[model samples]
Target chain A: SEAYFRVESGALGPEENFLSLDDILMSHEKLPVRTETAMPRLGAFFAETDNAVPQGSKLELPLWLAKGLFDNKRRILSVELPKIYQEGWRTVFSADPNVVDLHKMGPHFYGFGSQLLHFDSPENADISQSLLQTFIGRFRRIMDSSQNAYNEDTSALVARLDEMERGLFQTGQKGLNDFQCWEKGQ
Target chain B: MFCEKAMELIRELHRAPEGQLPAFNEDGLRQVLEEMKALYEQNQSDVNEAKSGGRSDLIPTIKFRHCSLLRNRRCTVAYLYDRLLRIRALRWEYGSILPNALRFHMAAEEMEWFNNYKRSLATYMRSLGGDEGLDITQDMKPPKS
Candidate 1:
């Protein structure tokens, strides 16, 4: 079959794929943040104030905004780790990655975790390791199911896959189908 | 909260099944543009104050609004560009003529673009293969030896 139009894939690493809709939506995931400097005339937008966002005010900001305002030298804002990447969850994930439902915790788990590295955090190294380990632990199962489950209902199998993994699964399924078609002399 | 409307547009597109076109979100686009206008005006006034009154304190707020304006621009342009790519794919997959259901998803300008693309492709085909003009879109699969 002829290939259809493909949407640009989101980068799973630290660098963002600017025009990718998946990247845009992944970046839309919110992050917890604390303001370092007061923002004038933006109180209503960020907080319950009348005119300005007072210094040291805590708020939840989308990843795009956090990325835009994050300044190491100026100390504009400080980003906190979301719960999924915290020490407790990391411990759980390291223990057994397959048991956790990534779809519930994050449909964009891997992508968003990579983005958290942009913030200067003491746990950066640990978070990076955990992310890698989690993916490594879960990848074999994904590969196994994608290649073997031809002409079968995959809704149950695909229920827990993160967005990036789903793409991989689909690619594997396509390859399998094409191979079968060739063998059948279509 | 800033650029939420623009994010909504991106979400709507993302939610649709692959290769299926959703109706053009004119209202959402307008709302995003309006938000950008408001951000720009706010930044302008603050910039003027910072320059004339020596109010350096407002600089961070100006930067904040400016970032929002750029984000809105990125989302809006991406939405339109992605839609155009889908429409272009339709020409190859469904031929030059699109059904009314798909046509209704396009804006007037997109229709014009489709027609222009069809004419351009036709002219290019006529230029090749000794004037009989091969239909390159056909037989996409490679033949076995």
Candidate 2:
């Protein structure tokens, strides 16, 4: 029944349901990839014996080929943790604890957010799994509050629609919905 | 009753003369959608009845497309709510570093969408003998995040 409503309403236009790392890499996967295991290139020339690739050597491959090689344990994909992030993480830990704002952390930070916390332990440094968890809790609370606002606005729209429906019926509009034309007589 | 439920949410948005917050949550969205579904089914039965020559004159050329329109509007409302939630979740990841230009532009744009909806309804109501001066903006509080 809901499926029929979806059809009738013409909802669900072109939009991704959620965002992910795959979306980020799609447009920016042109960076160099490095060989991990000795990978094959299907009759490719190489200085080494049997066309074997060497580890620690920078190589470039198509995004699909790189994904395939990485999945097959042939290539290593390394994402650099920016130097400033460590200090920013420290600032979040001590100097400016309130900087835990995820927006301030930025998109590049999110890709490595979880891994960032593992480096600093509760005993060694102020950062810990507990701290990160608390920070996320703060984030979610703000998000729920934000959503509450939109829900109210949309709710108002629905209320007004209902009022108009009832009012039109009382006035003998005959048609329902807001935009439909009524009879000429009444 | 559906509108009443919606108004309950509206009043919930504002701070009480007493210190309080709203109890409405994601579940409210489900109820609204279910309400629309029930109305849709009721109208579909009407369309079926008209086909069988029962109150055949009741069937206009548009075949009660108003019900479909209301369902569609409800869908718009639902989608907007979902979009808002998604945007809120995004704030969890993105934080205050968002560009001021984008942030201000995003804010109150949804308000305009709601305003557009009200205006559409207002135009329709005016066509009838119903009160054309219906003000939906009354008691509306600006959303604070």
Candidate 3:
């Protein structure tokens, strides 16, 4: 049956029979939640979540420090999200919790950003796990760690990041797998 | 809603009404007397629950066990400062393996690294004018004498 598969199906007009993703599930694997929507909308999903960030307000760092952090995150994304590593680098500012904001200025990028281009950084993203790991590295390296008590803000941040990594961080209790953390050696 | 109006009324009920206390008047004193008794008998549970829940929602209230090393002023300051710096510097040094190293226990991914980091921070705190340092581990009894 030469059906909708044909690019030019002049016989039946604009072909009406299209096999859905749901059909593939029951016929193949024993599916629990039959997912038959447009490919998981990660791009726009991340772009829109970035609404928390204003047009500006990224946490700008000392140039060297910024270089270190971004460079570190670059490698992290490459390793963690190699599948989407091509889209791994993105610019996110402190003001926005979850957003993807970017624009073209010249042959290269111009707007104040952390990464070289636009991409995703929501906590759930696989790349974000390593991105956060990299960010923790920054706090560990640069801060006046040996300063007076109340000076080593780096330690505090790392602690927070540690908590988040362990699933004990303040965005807390949002359906966490404590068992996983425990097994990982809490 | 529990957000404001209802909670306010319940909270205020415990307070002496205007012009009711002995300082204000008989009714105020009576309100205080009545509320004091009622608070103990009826509201203590609610008050305790609120405090426990409130503490959880708050920031950085990690309990310092009596034997934890950050017992002294210098140690505490050093620890806090180190943490503050980590927070401040996060926008920069992020993703560095070194950052991860300093964050935790005495040994990397072990208690030894954490203690070493604490020692480094405490030493820095003393230099910054903090003093009266204590090594919390010292408080532990020497293997049951």
Candidate 4:
């Protein structure tokens, strides 16, 4: 029997677990934003301009920055929905959730989607619904493949899974392996 | 943009396989700290102007830099904390004496922390299960039958 240390796990919910490395990486994902005010002396990072990031400049910002700068009343920046969370993609997701390659679309698909809710988008309700439905629709296949793929290469099976789904798959596989070992008296 | 250096440090840790430690990113950490210092200085000046000079328009810019500083702080803290968690796990996985290969990945302070953790764990285990004392690290799974 191997001794296992408790590792901090990332939260899959809307609120980020600040200390979790997974949550850190997931929040590092960029979001498209339009500046509501001119940010002085910070243009070099976001744009090709000289010193100031002029008002209404469109740029992609990491989620952390967007979250920190966002103020509903002040309107420092307005977050735009990443295309995947838009009406068109929501339709595609609803039509057939598992058909798309979530890894390509967003490696942190589920976690990132949940974080977007913090921005108070008009489409928040629909986005939440789509995320829930997508997860519900694809979870069965993920669990089946994870539990059944014993002693085999799993790269192909996990290729399309989002990070959250991959974690679930790994947990299922671990459970299977532990059960087998127990059955074999090892 | 502002916290790119900090983000790079985070990405390095995130890239490494779970339960493995990359070398201590001292240089990257310094760079992030330097960035934070610069951000702080600029924001300080901007804040002074907004207060004394009555340039209310600069409030947005000050807020922007302040937010960036906070982001950098979060990233740096999370990066160091996550590394510590991995180092703590190493004690359970590799035991008190870490292999040279893994030890080389840790900073001097981290090695000290590991030693302290080992000492505390030993003290706690020695106090448990009466005179004989128990090796709690062993028998993680119960035997059947």
- Using lDDT, give the best candidate's number: 1
Tens-digit lDDT string for candidate 3 (B1-145) = 0012212222232242221111212243344344445434433443444378432211111111111111122222322233333332322233213343334311223333335555675576456554655543233333532
lDDT of 4 by residue, A36-129 (tens): 8876667775533227777998889888878888977737889999999999999999999989889999998888998888888888999999
Stretches off by above 4 angstroms in model 2 are A1-34, A37-54, A58-97, A100-105, A111-186, B1-145
Strongest candidate by DockQ: 1
CAPRI accuracy category, model 3: incorrect
lDDT of 2 at A135: 42
In model 3, the runs with Cα more than 4 Å from the true position are A1-127, A142-186, B1-140, B143-145
The models' CA-based lDDT, in order, is: 0.84, 0.37, 0.27, 0.82
| Clash pairs for candidate 1 | none
Quote model 2's TM-score: 0.23
lDDT of 2 by residue, A1-186 (tens): 111111111111222112211222221222255544443222152144324445465654423233333433332433223333444565554543333443333322332333333222233243344344434544433333334433444233223222212222233322222224323324
Positional deviation of residue B3's Cα in model 3 after best superposition, in angstroms: 6.0
How far does residue A85 in candidate 2 sit from its true spot (Å)?
5.9
lDDT of 2 by residue, B48-91 (tens): 76678355433331122343334334333544453344344333
Candidate 4 stretches with Cα past 4 Å from truth are: A1-11, A45-50, A149-154, B141-145
Ranking by lDDT: 1, 4, 2, 3
The alpha-carbon RMSD values of the candidates against the true structure, listed in the order shown, are: 2.6, 25.2, 28.2, 2.8
Model 1: residues with Cα > 4 Å off, grouped in runs: A1-4, A45-50, A149-153, A180-186, B143-145
Q: What TM-score, to 2 decimal places, does chain A of model 2 have?
A: 0.30
Candidate 4 residue lDDT tens string, B1-145: 5788888988888787765788999999999999999989988988887789746667777877888888788888988877777888887877889998889989999999889989999889998978649988887667756
Clashing pairs in 4: none
lDDT of 1 by residue, A20-54 (tens): 89988888889989989888788886533327788
Worst 10 contiguous positions by lDDT, candidate 4 chain B? B53-62
What is the fnat score of candidate 4?
0.47
